[PDB]
Structure 1
Amino acid sequence: NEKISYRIEGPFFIIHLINPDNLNALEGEDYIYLGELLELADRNRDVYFTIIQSSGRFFSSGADFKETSKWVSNFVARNVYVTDAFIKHSKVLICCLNGPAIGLSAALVALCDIVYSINDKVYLLYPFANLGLITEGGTTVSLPLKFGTNTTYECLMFNKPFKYDIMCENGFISKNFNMPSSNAEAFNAKVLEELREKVKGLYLPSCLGMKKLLKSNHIDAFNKANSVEVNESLKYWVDGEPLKRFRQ
Structure 2
Amino acid sequence: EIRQNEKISYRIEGPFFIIHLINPDNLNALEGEDYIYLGELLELADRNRDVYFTIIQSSGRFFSSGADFKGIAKAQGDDTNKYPSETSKWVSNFVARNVYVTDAFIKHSKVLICCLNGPAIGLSAALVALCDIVYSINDKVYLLYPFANLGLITEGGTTVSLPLKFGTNTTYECLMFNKPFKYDIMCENGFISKNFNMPSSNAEAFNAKVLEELREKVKGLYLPSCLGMKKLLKSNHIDAFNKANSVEVNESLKYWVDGEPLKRFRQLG
Sort the TM-score into its range (normalised by shorter chain).
over 0.9
Percent identical: 100
Shift of 1:70: 2.2
- Partner SS for 2:134: strand
Deviations 1:187-233 (A, max 9, x none): 00100010000000010000001000000010000001001102222
Does the alignment pair 1:144 with 2:163? yes
**2:87–2:257 contact (8 Å) kept in structure 1:** no
Q: Which residue of 1 aligns with 2:205?
A: 186
Query: 2-side partners of 1:234 and 1:37: how far apart?
Result: 26
Partner of 2:122 in structure 1?
103
Question: Hey, what's the Cα distance between the residues in 2 that align with 1:132 and 1:73?
Answer: 19
Q: Is the 8 A contact 2:12 2:18 kept in 1?
A: yes
Which whole-Å CA distance do the structure 2 matches of 1:18 and 1:72 have between them?
A: 28
Identify which of 233, 246, 251 aligns with 1:214.
233
- Scaled by the length of structure 2, the TM-score of the pair is 0.90
**Take 1:67 and 1:88, find their aligned partners in 2: how far apart are those partners?**
30
- How far, CA to CA, are the matches of 1:71 and 1:148 in structure 2? 31
Query: What secondary structure, in the 3-state scheme, does the structure 2 residue paired with 1:60 have?
Result: coil
Q: If the length of structure 1 is used for normalisation, what is the TM-score?
A: 0.97
Distance in 2, matches of 1:222 and 1:173, equals: 21
The residue number in structure 2 matching 1:45 is 49
CA distance in 1, matches of 2:259, 2:228: 45
Question: Which stretch of structure 1 is more off in the superposition, 8-17 or 71-80?
Answer: 71-80
Give the Å deviation of 1:71. 4.5
Structure 1 CA distance, aligned partners of 2:24 and 2:250?
34
For these two proteins, the number of residue pairs brought into alignment is 248
CA distance in 1, matches of 2:193, 2:158: 20
Q: Which moved more, 1:233-242 or 1:67-76?
A: 67-76
* Change in CA separation of 1:206 and 1:132 when aligned onto 2, cut-off 3 Å: same
Residues 217, 68 of structure 1: alpha-carbon distance in 2 compared, 3 angstrom cutoff: closer
Q: Which runs of 5+ in 2 are unaligned?
A: 70-84
Cα distance in 2, alignment partners of residues 105 and 19 from structure 1: 14
Larger deviation, residues 238-247 vs 4-13: 238-247
Correspondence list, 1:108-123, <5 A = 108-123=127-142
| 1:121 partner SS | coil
Return 228-237 or 174-183, whichever deviates more: 228-237
1:109-166: per-residue Cα shift (whole Å, max 9, x none)?
0000000000000000000001111000000000011000000001000001000000
CA apart distance, 1:234? 2.1
How many Å separate the matches in 1 of 2:222 and 2:88? 51
CA offsets, 1:91-121, max 9 Å, x none?
A: 0000000000001000000000000000000
Return closer, same or farther for 1:67/1:156 CA change in 2, 3 Å cut-off. closer
**1:11 is matched with which residue: 15, 31, 45?**
15
Cα distance in 2, alignment partners of residues 55 and 191 from structure 1: 14
**Structure 2 CA distance for aligned equivalents of residues 69 and 211 of structure 1:** 37
Q: CA RMSD in A?
A: 1.8
Q: For residue 73 of structure 1, report the CA deviation from its aligned partner.
A: 2.7
